[PDB]
């Protein structure tokens, strides 16, 4: 809240194209996903490898971020550069709930995306 009130760019991208919405969907922090979506985050933003904030939530198994992302405009059937749609990343690691929800919204048709992290410690 303080950062957004200061004027921080909501859709800032890292070296590989990850947005704060991407990281929040990856780590399962839904209250911040809701906050970013309220503050005009790109729900269909794509990294350099074509991964959406919905491919991260499905590769990490967060079924409620899958829901809240779908309801806020997340587009299924979008294909990353690796060739995987959010429902196959789901089926590939066998998340029954994320696959069960993404199966309803996804029409008929081995790389894991990980956001950059800080390893600094004193």
């Amino acid at each position: 809240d303080v950062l957004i009130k200061h004027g921080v760019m909501v859709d800032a991208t890292t070296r590989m194209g990850y947005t704060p919405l991407h990281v929040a969907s990856h780590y399962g922090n839904i209250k911040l996903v809701k906050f970013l979506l309220q503050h005009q985050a790109d729900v269909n933003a794509k990294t350099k490898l074509g991964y959406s904030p919905l491919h991260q939530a499905a590769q990490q198994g967060h079924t409620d971020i899958v829901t809240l992302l779908l309801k806020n405009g997340a587009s299924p059937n979008e294909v990353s550069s690796d060739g995987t749609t959010p429902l196959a990343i789901a089926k590939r690691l066998g998340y029954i709930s994320v696959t069960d929800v993404l199966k309803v919204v996804t029409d008929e048709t081995h790389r894991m995306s990980f956001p950059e992290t800080v390893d600094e410690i004193l």
Binding site: I30, L70, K71, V104
Partner: protein, 153 residues
């Protein structure tokens, strides 16, 4: 106490399913729905409470913390069955898009918007003289698209 003035109708689910806890997830939180009849109250009232921190109440015997409280109290009125009203509130709370929206709601308007899409994606099945069990299966596509419409914007 008192005996209700309006005619008593036996519960349909009791007549259908009754007459003849390890499944609970570890991180799940409880929702208590309380329905009561009060002749002294002017109109039916709804009370929805979300606690800041989930708390263990003596109301629920289970070791599941309470997060949400549903309070539906009112006088006897036509077309108002408080058991059925509590069942509807509990079914709404059990819905996925509604739960996640009740968890994230910061005002009553968000809850109202969530209940509107539950009603838009609800399939009303009117009475028919011939239950064929095969014309029912014709509504499978209808059920699937009303779910794609709830799971989607």
């Amino acid at each position: 106490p008192s005996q209700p003035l309006l005619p008593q109708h036996s519960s349909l689910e009791t007549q259908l399913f009754c007459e003849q806890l390890e499944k609970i997830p570890p991180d799940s939180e409880a929702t208590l729905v309380l329905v009561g009849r009060a002749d002294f109250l002017e109109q039916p009232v709804l009370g929805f409470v979300r606690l800041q921190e989930a708390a263990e109440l003596e109301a629920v015997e289970l070791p599941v913390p309470i997060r949400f409280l549903f309070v539906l109290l009112g006088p006897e009125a036509p077309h108002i069955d408080y058991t059925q009203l509590g069942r509807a509130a509990a079914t709404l709370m059990s819905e996925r898009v509604f739960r996640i929206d009740a968890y994230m709601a910061q005002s009553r308007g968000e809850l109202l918007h969530s209940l509107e899409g539950f009603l838009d994606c609800s399939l009303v099945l009117p009475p028919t003289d011939a239950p064929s069990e095969q014309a029912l299966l014709s509504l499978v596509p209808v059920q699937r698209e009303l779910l794609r419409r709830r799971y989607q914007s």
